[PDB]
Nucleic acid binder design. Structure first.
Lengths: 97, 105, 92, 83, 92, 105, 78, 97
DNA sequence: CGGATGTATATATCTGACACGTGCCTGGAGACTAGGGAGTAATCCCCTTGGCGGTTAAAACGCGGGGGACAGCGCGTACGTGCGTTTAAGCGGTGCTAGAGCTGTCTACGACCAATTGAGCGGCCTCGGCACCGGATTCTCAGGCCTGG
DNA sequence: CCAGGCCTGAGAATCCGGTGCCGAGGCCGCTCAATTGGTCGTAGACAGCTCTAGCACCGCTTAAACGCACGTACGCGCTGTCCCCCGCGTTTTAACCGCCAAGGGGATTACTCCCTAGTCTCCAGGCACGTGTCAGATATATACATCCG
């Protein structure tokens, strides 16, 4: 049957998700994770929907920027595939611990 | 008999409100008379530049309202604006379309 | 009540592009941008007044704060606009 | 109710989609654990600052203003939620 | 007559390591470090009293500023030290 | 009868001088009575920590006088101090010795 | 005057940075990067001096400019 | 006799990491600073403390940049550092757009 | 495993930088007032948390496979290393003067308070720009057949 | 026997006209913050004076830099392999929407008490200056490690 050669769907997904402006993380799982991290600090914390939306936007933007840097490192290493060492190098150069 | 300070400076942005903000922010003990006028002029110039590029993006995308996507496209397409707002995230803006050349067939 | 720059941004937008509107989210982003630039200028003016042991903030302090906070071309046009506005205010 | 092991809610397709938005064409299979750890660290920092602001405000609810202030603390200014 | 922290830093050094001295350059560096931490804490206290409509800066503001500025264990120990100091001041 | 504020709090750093600095910086309209004491306590603790680490480095170098090299070694070897002081460069301090295994034979 | 930053000096800076082997064009690249850095810092320092109504650039102005770039300097007055 | 390539490099690395002395000639750096400042305001005088501060800042910046460049070179499975490594380091750090 | 190149070391030295004594003046401490800001107690009501089910879109699982990472190997050259020569940095002794730094005046600029009024904010309501969608049209994508080579 | 075409099916992206919906943009009422005219106090503009230090210059020394030769380690291109993400189909599950209910805390008001700014007055801690002296940098000789021949 019909079969896209690998890479074509990846490029199309890149184009689609760079054209779109919608949040790529599921809201309920993100909210649950945020509340877990919060109760790790102060018990019985309420949240606002705007606060959770702000956290989700910040997290998505941070991850996309980190993935751009990781892609740059992978291309530098003469690779198409991104690997955890690329993320580690990017974070080390940026100055994150 | 009452002429607003914006009209005297030939500006749109509120000189009086900027004055009140500067005085309430406790930035200095005394505030000059031309400081609010200068700051209003700078702010309106920056807003006009951003809005002009955003409207250009909106017209290019065959629309008639400026949206966060248009604002982000303007910011990331103007070199000096992107330099000013390098570490700023625009909500509901996405990313500037960019695919590295090596990844393309 | 909450105070924003929606009216003023709409006036500027109708000056530059008479036939283009704006959404609520875009207005929110523009209001945040204006407030951010206002803080980034006022804090710098305050710190320069502290450095020079000067109790007052003047058009000169805001001019040098603008030169410090904005890139080249933006600073040039902003200084021109501010000088023009201050000259007009003094004349009138 | 105590919440446990919620980091798996950031599924493999979500990480893949974020990478695709970032311009990534091929993703290794070990990227997801590292990405989950990095996201956890970032969220812990931002939420710690947000809860500090909330506790100073003598409040039991976190606000979008608190999150925005935390993100300025990290130098990650966010437009569209106030400020 | 420039005001410095030379005497107090020397006293702290003699209280910690009595057999180790200090150089002029090292004292300059320590003075700069103390000043920088002071402005960081004070500025984050002002930008924290401003966001709660509070005209005053108190021990609570300084404590939360320390929590925001310093890393974890360092802020914990600093909070303990400040609480002990304020308790002694109130008692005396 | 003139008991110093520093003695009243068991501190070495100048409570009165810190009060004057806080009030002349106009950080707030009013200053609480415990704010200068708290600031002095935190500053003294930080100075004591840095000086203790620097003196340890000086002893490890078989010297009886702290130098900027000792200060920088202490700051870069303490994790929390390095996190606090990361974009800060120290005059006449140099760098930590670090040659990776790839470079080493 | 940019040629005053000689190849041996760049090699010494690399050695303090932990470089075991250097390529040819690294010297030109380093000169360009140093020129950009100095342009930014000197621009801010000159702005501070002009605001001070002076004609001599002071170490305090240089330190304040460096603090603006997020890279503070301890030892010259802070 | 002749040392093999690398031994002198390692000894120089240890020597220049154990030291705290400026590696750039003071008079050439002063002339470069004056030349750069000539493009902003004519007839500027300087202070020795100012030039020393600029020299310290430039040396620290270049050392950090070379550390990041070495990291990138090792990532690319190399011992040699190259201009592409400097460009990648600056791109991740944020100086280069 | 020898040797030369380096680091480290033991000891003299000599030294200039660090530590201590002393005088003075400026900023810190004590006392009293008064006034506004912080803490506390009530009350409202709005937003946040929590339970359900249903349809359903997205996640999870499995599998063939093909494209890419990774290791190995050989070639050429570019960089490291060493030596002779040249270039100018560094020191330091002199001279000059532009300009930092502080002082005195006096004046214009800004703070401050009361009354007035117009601009801007909340609320409301209508309509048109935009999200969605199914038929049509074109645009890249991928395997294939007979002929050119 | 290999390729290299056009072919040509074939899904995907684009275009387009229809319809519908809810948020943008204008109008109205009100209220509260900006404006104005006046007075008072002091911050700064301006002009002088002085003397620190910044600049220009010269000459001597020698230490770092330049240029060149030689060699070998490494960057890079290529090739083979094996494996591990990718694309696609099928099953599961819990995100999501809608609706409702409960109650808890954020916002607001009111009252009271005490904490701090302000002003004055006294006097000792802190800073600049002078001077003694010892930890360390330096010259130089030496034992010790080690990497290449």
């Amino acid at each position: 049957p019909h079969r896209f050669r690998p890479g074509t769907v990846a490029l199309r997904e890149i184009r689609k998700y760079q054209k779109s402006t919608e949040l790529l993380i599921r809201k309920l799982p993100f909210q649950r994770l945020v509340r877990e991290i919060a109760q790790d600090f102060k018990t019985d914390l309420r949240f606002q929907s705007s606060a959770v939306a702000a956290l989700q936007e910040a997290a998505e933007a941070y991850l996309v920027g980190l993935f751009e840097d990781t892609n740059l490192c992978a291309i530098h290493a003469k690779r198409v595939t991104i690997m955890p060492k690329d993320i580690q190098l990017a974070r080390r150069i940026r100055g994150e611990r | 008999k009452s002429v607003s300070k914006s009209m005297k400076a030939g500006l749109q942005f509120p000189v009086g409100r900027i004055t009140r903000f500067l005085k309430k922010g406790r930035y200095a003990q005394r505030l000059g008379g031309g400081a609010p006028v200068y700051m209003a002029a700078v702010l309106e110039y920056l807003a006009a530049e951003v809005l002009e590029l955003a409207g250009n993006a909106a017209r290019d995308n065959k629309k008639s309202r400026i949206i966060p996507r248009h604002l982000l496209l303007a910011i990331r397409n103007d070199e000096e604006l992107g330099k000013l707002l390098s570490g700023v995230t625009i909500a509901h803006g996405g990313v500037l379309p960019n695919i590295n050349s090596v990844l393309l067939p | 009540s909450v105070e924003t720059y929606k009216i003023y941004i709409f006036k500027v937008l109708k000056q530059v592009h008479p036939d283009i509107g704006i959404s609520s989210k875009a207005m929110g982003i523009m209001n945040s941008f204006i407030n951010d630039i206002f803080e980034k200028l006022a804090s710098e003016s305050s710190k320069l007044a502290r450095y020079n042991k000067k109790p007052t903030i003047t058009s000169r302090e805001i001019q040098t704060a603008v030169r410090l906070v904005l890139p080249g071309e933006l600073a040039k046009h902003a200084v021109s606009e501010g000088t023009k506005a201050v000259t007009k205010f003094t004349s009138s | 109710k105590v919440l446990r092991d919620n980091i798996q809610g950031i599924t493999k397709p979500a990480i893949r989609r974020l990478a695709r938005r970032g311009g990534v064409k091929r993703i290794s299979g070990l990227i997801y654990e590292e990405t989950r750890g990095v996201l956890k660290i970032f969220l812990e920092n931002v939420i710690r600052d947000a809860v500090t602001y909330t506790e100073h405000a003598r409040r039991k609810t976190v606000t979008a203003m608190d999150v925005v202030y935390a993100l300025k603390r990290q130098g990650r200014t966010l437009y569209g939620f106030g400020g």
